Design a protein around this ligand. Structure first.
Ligand SMILES: Nc1ncnc2c1ncn2[C@@H]1O[C@H](COP(=O)(O)OP(=O)(O)OP(=O)(O)O)[C@@H](O)[C@H]1O
Ligand SMILES: Nc1ncnc2c1ncn2[C@@H]1O[C@H](COP(=O)(O)OP(=O)(O)O)[C@@H](O)[C@H]1O
Ligand SMILES: Nc1ncnc2c1ncn2[C@@H]1O[C@H](COP(=O)(O)OP(=O)(O)O)[C@@H](O)[C@H]1O
Ligand SMILES: [Mg+2]
Ligand SMILES: [Mg+2]
Ligand SMILES: [Mg+2]
Ligand SMILES: [Zn+2]
Ligand SMILES: [Zn+2]
Lengths: 189, 49, 619, 444, 99
């Protein structure tokens, strides 16, 4: 994210004297790549978690490009005060809404419990895509089965790959965050 | 062709496709390797080359 | 010492905690060896040399030297295992204090627990006890990440709620944030957490051990942090672990008896390329009878069919792949078709190839196939994850697909195998997966001729139900006739009955894996090159053979056959482990290719070609 | 889960089935396919949401009402009063479990289990000579003639010795028999005799068995997460006999399944979320109608019937039952069956009772013959003679599979006489059986 | 890398570039491509020339008459009853459009 806004600042200064309309500095995604050897999809143990991992794989499907938010404005149900520009996190990571209105001026009484409704129109959102990457067929050992991985694309990693195209893909291992079966502590990686 | 190779006796009969799918075409070559001693020995040379 | 209280509560008391921890430290340092070596020093040395993270100790040694711990072990295994984790951590840090960064943890496994229970008989009386068991893995999911010391962002204030240990029983749940004092919607900090590998397998009782009227029973099992992917499906495995009930599994839901599931936290799983290989393989390669030794080491459970033993040798070792420029696909794979009248060891041959050659799979034209020729994508049932099950060939991309009963494969499999051996790539376009998985198969196949009997009057193509292009490209066609004969049948019967009496249950050339090391060595490391053959001789050979074959109904030898001849030459050079093809190898490849061609040819023309070309088949 | 025995069905009634709970120590005693007597309570286990119509419901008898804004109505009302439907279901609670037709009042272990009387009975049975034809008569008092079928089916019941190679190839030990013939020639009758006689003798006919029930099916444990692998006909016939009728009229989709069972003695089912490798060492007794309805002795067997070539290869014995019209035999058959109908209860002279021979089978099964060197010499030379016969022509050609069949039948004759050595007597009789089974195709 | 067949090589040359499509002021369409049929013997490099031409076209697909392994020949479209979308299985002909 630091790199992303750094790119944003240098972008605005280089394009600085911009014409009408195109002045609100648009967000500048920073995708990556490398020259090192990709590591096999069977080598993603726990210890390489939340690190930077490049891997080889074969796509076998691709969900639709749909709309996940990055900024969301909510507004209370009593006083209609907004709470705009909330930093929605990236990747598969939900966000528990705030619980109590913060005015101290809703009236002589106070605002109810859980007063905020998300303002849909005032959310600025992006493209995202849930890919189903499957192990390389020549990479799979003899007797075993092809391993898999759920993949999460972003704005300009969406629709760049079609089902069946082998990829070398550079990203971040992660577990889902939606609010914390003979097993426990096992979130969908 | 149906009969393994092109036998000369079945000329004008040694093809099973319909004329309404030979019509669509723009050139239709028959390929038979009948009697060419020099060509075939040179062909052995060529392939192992 | 012992008292009225239970074993678990006893070992929970701090006094005996220090007692048994001291005892474990004591015998870790002092139980020297059977023959005075201090084996724990060397075991720890190798353990830290690899950073194995897990030690293993023998229960017989444990109990024999110190028996109180051994008696306590099945009673309250969890507590003893935790303490031994701590004590092993102490001793490994003592030996290598530098280990502190290395995983901050050592697991300990217990082997040779004397009392093996059977998966039929695991009752209430084994709960919360460490048992030993046997079985076969029916399923094994992938490695998943588990929380082990989890930190939580209090997402009201972003304080990092400290690292909570995560037991296997119930999911950890922080009470409130120490800063803002809220039981807020906490959520895991993805980074500061230190996860742990989690894999879930399912073992079942082996059919060799199941009784007469039965269904084999299956127990789950959890592998953690070092044993994950220590066992694949179908592996006969011994499992030692804490048979376990109290996690959250219970049928407290409606419409159910108050009945609990169970698992096994596996504490030890035991299944049941190299150097000097160059030395041994080259030393025997000096012998120069190695070709015939290979021919007599291939398929020892079959009688006769020496032609097909030799032919499959050439198929196994293969030729070489080349591409003059990026324009011409010339291949190194020698594809073989046995065509045989029934009861003549076709499937016996195929199963030998499956046994011996790495990256081999089996498949059948009929629908009883373990693995299929076509490629399809679906939701695989035992895992319920949406696989691209690429077909049999692609799964045998390097080595061998083995097509038993090649003469009845459905037309989709005809299409697929044709396109495989023609393109050498399988072009899948089913759901949205418009791809082309390369399939460098080396297909072996078996086919029963029409009418259940070979007909020498008709030719090979018209007495086998395989169409012309399919029958063409197979580098070897072999014929298997079950000709009645006194001495032959006597020999075959004596061999079979000898095998039978030897394989009664009262009695309970080169070795096969030696041959396998030879196979990989001569298949990858050695690439014999060809500038040392009588080019003019072989060119005139093609000239003479085709010139004789010039006739009606006499589909002649062609460049297919001449390139197959070069493939076979390279294969024999490979087989001799040479780095340069020689006239001897060229003679043998000539011999086998010409034998295949004449025996493809029907009887009268076969006799003509045999009579006029006996000089080559003489060698 | 158990269901009504076939004897106790009413008219037009599905067999009811009820669930029986087995508490500690009476727990693995029952097994799938057995015929067990159960004793215990009939209890009721609570059920919920069994019906879409409201029924009997409990509720506290306290006379509470609801204050304003919290009035005990709707979902709040039902939760407050603690309303709950009372729907039950009969669930038998088996206190004890025995076989309904016990074999014994209790080779060395079974011998110890033998009572003294049954032990001496089977001993003099083994010591008996002419036990061969005696067992034929006892198994088939109804039948007349068809001695070859009698002999083959008896040897099938005894079975061969399964073996396995050092490499891991599972040599077959069972011996599959096929009866093929003109209509109304006691084929289905032989299969019914084997069914009604033996335990672990499952029966099925032609297109009455879809493959899933034929071999194996799957269900999820209604209680837990695990899956129960429901046992099909091959499983219930495991280590025993499966009598398949109208074998020629089995779909390819399942005839290949039983072919897999015959090749491997095992079927591995992976379906609907469970994988397992179920063992089925059963032996198949098949009935096959010829094509056209009537067998044709001027044609080969492979073109008289329509089995797949590998299936026909696997089949160990083939018997041809031609319905020729010879009147001495016709008088014999008419007299036999009419005698049976007039004198149902008597007119049977099974010299050994059904229980006697059944116990004899169970005791004999565990003896595994050797093959002595003299018998091996006779085996090889006789197979050579059989090939000389093959070299006119038989309706189904001779291969090495017929050598395999002959050695397995020699083993099964040694098993009949409970020997530890297969002798030339057994080898000669096995060869005679195969030689008479294989017939010369009769061109005019 | 094939011996002779010089007319066939030049034919492949002309084929690979193909003609020029005509859409007429009425609206009808005339093809701008060339078709090459190669009847004949086994021994000659017919399938091998097919192999190379597929490799050498910008977009090209080399298939059998009997479809392909998990791939048809002509396209097909089929309704999906769950989602109601008309899924479009792409054959060789459409998967190598413009090719
Ligand atoms: N030469 C031989 N050496 C050893 N065993 C043989 C030989 N020929 C046949 N057999 C035996 O014949 C039996 C049948 O063998 P196999 O499975 O190869 O059958 P097949 O001829 O391929 O028949 P099918 O067409 O039904 O597959 C096996 O027991 C095999 O041992
Ligand atoms: N040799 C025989 N001995 C005794 N009964 C016979 C004989 N042949 C035919 N039968 C009678 O024929 C009846 C039907 O025979 P069955 O085997 O059912 O015909 P199919 O073989 O067509 O099923 C039997 O009930 C049996 O009584
Ligand atoms: N003129 C040639 N020169 C070299 N190799 C040839 C020639 N003709 C055929 N071949 C070889 O024969 C093999 C099969 O020929 P193929 O391309 O299938 O044509 P066809 O389909 O007519 O057999 C090819 O892999 C190729 O290597
Ligand atoms: Mg076979
Ligand atoms: Mg009948
Ligand atoms: Mg071709
Ligand atoms: Zn408010
Ligand atoms: Zn906080």
């Amino acid at each position: 994210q630091l790199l992303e806004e750094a790119a944003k600042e240098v972008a605005d200064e280089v394009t600085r004297p911009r014409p009408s309309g195109e002045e609100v500095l648009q967000d500048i995604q920073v995708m990556l790549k490398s020259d090192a050897s990709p590591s096999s999809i069977r080598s993603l143990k726990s210890d390489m978690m939340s690190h930077l991992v490049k891997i080889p794989g074969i796509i076998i499907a691709a969900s639709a490009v749909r709309a996940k938010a990055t900024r969301i404005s909510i507004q209370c149900r009593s006083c209609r005060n907004t709470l705009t520009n909330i930093a929605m996190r990236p990747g598969l990571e939900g966000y528990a809404l705030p619980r109590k209105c913060n005015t101290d001026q809703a009236g002589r009484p106070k605002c109810p419990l859980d007063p905020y409704f998300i303002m849909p129109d005032k959310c600025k959102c992006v493209d995202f895509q849930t890919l189903k990457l499957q192990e390389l067929p020549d990479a799979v050992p003899h007797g075993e089965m092809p391993r898999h991985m759920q993949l999460y694309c972003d704005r300009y990693l969406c629709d760049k790959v079609v089902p069946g195209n082998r990829v070398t893909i550079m990203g971040i291992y992660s577990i889902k965050k939606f609010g914390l079966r003979v097993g426990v502590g096992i979130r969908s990686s | 062709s149906v009969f393994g190779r092109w036998d000369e006796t079945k000329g004008e009969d040694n093809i099973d496709f319909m004329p309404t799918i030979l019509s669509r075409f723009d050139m239709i070559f028959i390929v038979k390797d009948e009697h060419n001693e020099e060509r075939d020995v040179m062909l052995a040379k060529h392939v192992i080359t | 010492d012992l008292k009225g209280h239970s074993v678990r509560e006893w070992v929970s008391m701090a006094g005996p905690r220090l007692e048994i921890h001291h005892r474990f430290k004591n015998f870790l340092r002092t139980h020297v060896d059977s023959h005075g070596h201090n084996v724990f020093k060397e075991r720890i040395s190798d353990m830290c040399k690899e950073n194995r993270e897990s030690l293993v100790v023998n229960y017989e040694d444990l109990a024999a030297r110190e028996h109180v711990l051994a008696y306590f072990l099945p009673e309250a295994p969890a507590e003893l295992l935790q303490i031994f984790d701590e004590a092993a951590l102490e001793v490994v840090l003592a030996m290598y204090p530098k280990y502190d960064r290395i995983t901050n943890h050592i697991h300990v496994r217990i082997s040779h627990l004397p009392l093996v229970e059977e998966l039929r008989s695991l009752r209430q009386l084994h709960l919360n006890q460490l048992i030993r068991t046997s079985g076969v893995v029916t399923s094994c999911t992938g490695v998943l990440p588990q929380l082990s010391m989890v930190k939580y962002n209090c997402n009201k204030c972003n304080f990092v709620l400290g690292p909570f240990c995560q037991s296997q029983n119930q999911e950890v749940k922080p009470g409130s944030c120490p800063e803002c004092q809220s039981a807020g919607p906490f959520e895991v900090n993805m980074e500061e957490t230190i996860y742990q590998n989690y894999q879930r397998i399912r073992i079942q009782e082996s059919p060799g051990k199941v009784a007469a009227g039965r269904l084999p029973r299956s127990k789950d099992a959890i592998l953690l942090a070092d044993l994950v992917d220590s066992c694949k499906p179908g592996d006969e495995i011994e499992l030692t672990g804490i048979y376990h009930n109290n996690y959250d599994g219970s049928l407290n839901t409606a419409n159910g008896f108050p009945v609990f599931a169970t698992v096994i936290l596996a504490n030890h799983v035991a299944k049941k390329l190299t150097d000097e290989d160059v030395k041994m393989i080259t030393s025997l390669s000096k012998d120069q009878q190695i070709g015939e030794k290979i021919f007599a080491s291939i398929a020892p459970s079959i009688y006769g069919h020496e032609d097909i033993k030799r032919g499959l040798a050439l198929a196994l070792f293969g030729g070489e792949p080349k591409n003059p420029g990026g324009k011409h696909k010339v291949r190194g794979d020698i594809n073989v078709l046995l065509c045989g009248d029934p009861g003549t060891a076709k499937s016996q041959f195929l199963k030998y190839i499956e046994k011996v050659s790495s990256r081999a799979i089996f498949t059948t034209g009929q629908g009883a196939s373990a693995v299929g020729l076509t490629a399809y994508v679906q939701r695989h049932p035992v895992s319920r994850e949406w696989t691209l099950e690429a077909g049999a060939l692609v799964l045998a991309d390097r080595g061998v697909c083995l097509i038993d009963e090649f003469d009845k494969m459905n037309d989709q499999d005809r299409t697929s195998i044709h396109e495989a051996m023609e393109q050498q790539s399988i072009s899948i376009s089913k759901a949205g997966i418009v791809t082309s998985l390369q399939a460098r198969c080396t297909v072996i196949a078996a086919a029963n001729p029409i009418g259940g009997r070979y007909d020498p009057s008709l030719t090979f193509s018209e007495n086998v139900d395989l169409t012309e292009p399919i029958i063409s490209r197979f580098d070897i066609l072999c014929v298997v006739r079950d000709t009645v004969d006194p001495v032959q049948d006597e020999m075959l019967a004596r061999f079979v009955v000898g095998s039978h009496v030897r394989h009664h249950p009262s009695n309970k050339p080169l070795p096969q894996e030696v041959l396998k090391k030879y196979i990989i060595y001569a298949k990858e490391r050695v690439h014999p090159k060809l500038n040392q053959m009588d080019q003019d001789k072989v060119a005139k050979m093609y000239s003479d053979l085709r010139k004789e074959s010039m006739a009606t109904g006499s589909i002649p030898i062609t460049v297919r056959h001449i390139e197959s001849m070069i493939r076979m030459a390279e294969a024999h050079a490979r087989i001799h482990l040479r780095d340069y093809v020689i006239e001897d190898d060229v003679n043998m490849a000539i011999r086998v290719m010409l034998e295949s061609f004449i025996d493809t040819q029907k009887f009268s023309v076969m006799r003509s070609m045999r009579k006029t070309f006996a000089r080559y088949l003489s060698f | 889960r158990i269901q009504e025995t076939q004897a106790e069905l009413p008219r037009g009634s599905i067999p009811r089935s009820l669930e029986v709970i087995l508490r500690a120590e009476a727990v693995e005693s029952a097994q799938a396919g057995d015929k067990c007597d159960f004793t215990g309570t009939l209890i009721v286990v609570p059920d919920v949401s069994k019906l879409s119509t409201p029924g009997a419901r409990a509720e506290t008898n306290s006379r509470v009402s609801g204050v304003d804004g919290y009035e005990t109505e709707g979902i709040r009302g039902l939760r407050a009063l603690g309303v709950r439907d009372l729907s039950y279901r009969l669930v038998f609670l088996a206190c004890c479990v025995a076989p309904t037709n016990p074999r014994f009042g209790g080779a060395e272990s079974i011998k110890n289990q033998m009572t003294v009387k049954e032990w001496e009975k089977v001993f003099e049975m083994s010591q008996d000579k002419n036990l061969y034809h005696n067992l034929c008569t006892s198994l088939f008092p109804t039948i007349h003639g068809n001695d070859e079928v009698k002999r083959g089916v008896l040897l099938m019941l005894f079975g061969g010795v399964p073996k396995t190679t050092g490499e891991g190839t599972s040599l077959r030990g069972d011996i599959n028999v096929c009866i093929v013939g003109d209509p109304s020639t006691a084929k289905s009758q032989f299969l019914k005799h084997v069914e009604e006689f033996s335990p672990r003798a499952v029966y099925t006919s032609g297109k009455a068995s879809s493959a899933a029930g034929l071999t194996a099916a799957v269900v999820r444990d209604e209680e837990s997460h695990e899956f129960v692998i429901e046992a099909g006909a091959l499983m219930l016939a495991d280590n025993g006999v499966c009598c398949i009728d109208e074998f020629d009229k089995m779909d390819v989709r399942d005839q290949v399944a039983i072919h897999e069972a015959m090749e491997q003695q095992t079927i591995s089912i992976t379906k609907a979320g469970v994988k397992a490798t179920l063992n089925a060492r059963t032996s198949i007794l098949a009935a096959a109608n010829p094509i056209s309805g009537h067998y044709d002795r001027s044609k080969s067997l492979k073109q008289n019937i329509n089995l797949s070539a590998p299936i026909m290869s696997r089949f160990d014995l083939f018997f041809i039952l031609v319905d020729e019209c010879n009147e001495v035999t016709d008088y014999a058959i008419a007299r036999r069956i009419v005698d049976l109908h007039s004198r149902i209860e008597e007119s049977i002279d099974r010299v050994y009772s059904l229980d006697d021979i059944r116990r004899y089978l169970l005791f004999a099964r565990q003896f595994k013959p050797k093959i002595s060197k003299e018998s091996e010499d006779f085996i090889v030379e006789q197979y050579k003679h059989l090939r000389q016969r093959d070299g006119t022509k038989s309706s189904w050609r001779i291969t090495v599979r017929q050598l395999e069949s002959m050695i397995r039948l020699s083993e099964a004759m040694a098993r009949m006489h409970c020997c530890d050595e297969v002798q030339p007597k057994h080898v000669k009789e096995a060869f005679r059986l195969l030689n008479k089974s294989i017939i010369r195709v009769e061109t005019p | 890398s094939i011996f002779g067949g010089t007319d066939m090589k030049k034919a492949i040359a002309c084929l690979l570039f193909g003609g020029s499509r005509k859409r007429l002021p009425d609206g009808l369409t005339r093809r701008g491509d060339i078709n090459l049929l190669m009847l004949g013997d086994p021994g000659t490099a017919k399938s091998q020339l097919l192999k190379f031409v597929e490799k050498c076209s910008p977009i090209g697909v080399y298939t059998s008459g009997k479809g392909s392994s998990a791939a048809g020949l002509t396209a097909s479209v089929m309704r999906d009853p769950s989602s109601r979308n008309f899924i479009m299985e792409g054959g060789a002909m459409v998967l190598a459009d413009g090719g």
